[PDB]
Amino acid sequence: EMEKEFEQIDKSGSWAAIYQDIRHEASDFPSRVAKLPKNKNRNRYRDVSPFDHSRIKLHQEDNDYINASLIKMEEAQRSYILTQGPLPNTVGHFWEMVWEQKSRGVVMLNRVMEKGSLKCAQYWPQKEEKEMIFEDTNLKLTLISEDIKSYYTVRQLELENLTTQETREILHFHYTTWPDFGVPESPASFLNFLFKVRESGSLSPEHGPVVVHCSAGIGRSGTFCLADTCLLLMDKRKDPSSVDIKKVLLEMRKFRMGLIQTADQLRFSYLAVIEGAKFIM
Ligand SMILES: COc1ccc(CN)cc1OC
Secondary structure (H helix, E strand, O other): OHHHHHHHHHHOOOHHHHHHHHHHHOOOOOOHHHHOHHHHHHOOOOOOOEOOOOEEEOOOOOOOEEEEEEEEEOOOOEEEEEEOOOOOOOHHHHHHHHHHOOEOEEEEOOOOEEOOEEOOOOOOOOOOOOOEEEOOOOEEEEEEEEEEOOOEEEEEEEEEEOOOOOEEEEEEEEEOOOOOOOOOOOOHHHHHHHHHHHHOOOOOOOOEOEEEEOOOOOOHHHHHHHHHHHHHHHHHOOOOOOOOHHHHHHHHOOOEOOOOOOHHHHHHHHHHHHHHHOOOO
16 A cells, blocks of 8 residues: 555655656657647746647637647546646636536636746636626626635636527636645645535536646646546555556656656645545545
8 A cells, every 4th residue: 555655755755766757757749739839828838738639629710729638537537627827818718618628617726826926817707796708709707606715715607608698607616725835734625625626526527527727737736636536546446555646647647748746746646645545434
């Protein structure tokens, strides 16, 4: 059981070394569409690109590019869209993707400002009475209700397709307490947040894939969908020990580069999964 492997890596302090093996073993696939010069202003970081094979395509015929990847975990029957925090000029694209993919939830793992810089556009309304219209994509977005708690906020949004007058209810799950530097001391609140998302049905196969992001959509977003997938495989399987967090992470990396940015995030994922199991007993 990984619990023993955890103590071993921890007692030897081999985390940086484990992490480097994963870096070296990780897939590399073309990302030609991301690097086209017409798409330069659709990427927040020049070194974080979706692979062409797993990129989400917008159904607008002009330019179908968005920095988003579909991560399909076949065994766990789970899918996720990892994307970057939208830019001022991609908020309309972001909501179009949510519409086109029939997503039920958006999980946000960053504050709009961290380290005194902007990590993300304000892409949802702040007040009931002040809805947002995206002109470029013919979508209207309305805050319905907002439920602020210590570690996270849940918002009920209405997304209206102005073209067809269809409306959908979107859930916004905003983990608001990820520290500016490093990782939470305890995974307790992250695990509570994860289950809250599960309970909503946002991760369920009767809906399009959940959209998950931080600023880049590889670090904290990686930790979210690594933990969800590992915990799900632990119920699914005859034998728990089978599930190897390093194998699951490398399988996820075939879909999006860089998932889990630091050895700290690797250690924290182990801790979340180990603790997360401990709540099954
Ligand atoms: C019958 O449905 C499922 C069975 C197993 C898993 C996960 N291994 C997910 C499912 O989705 C509902």
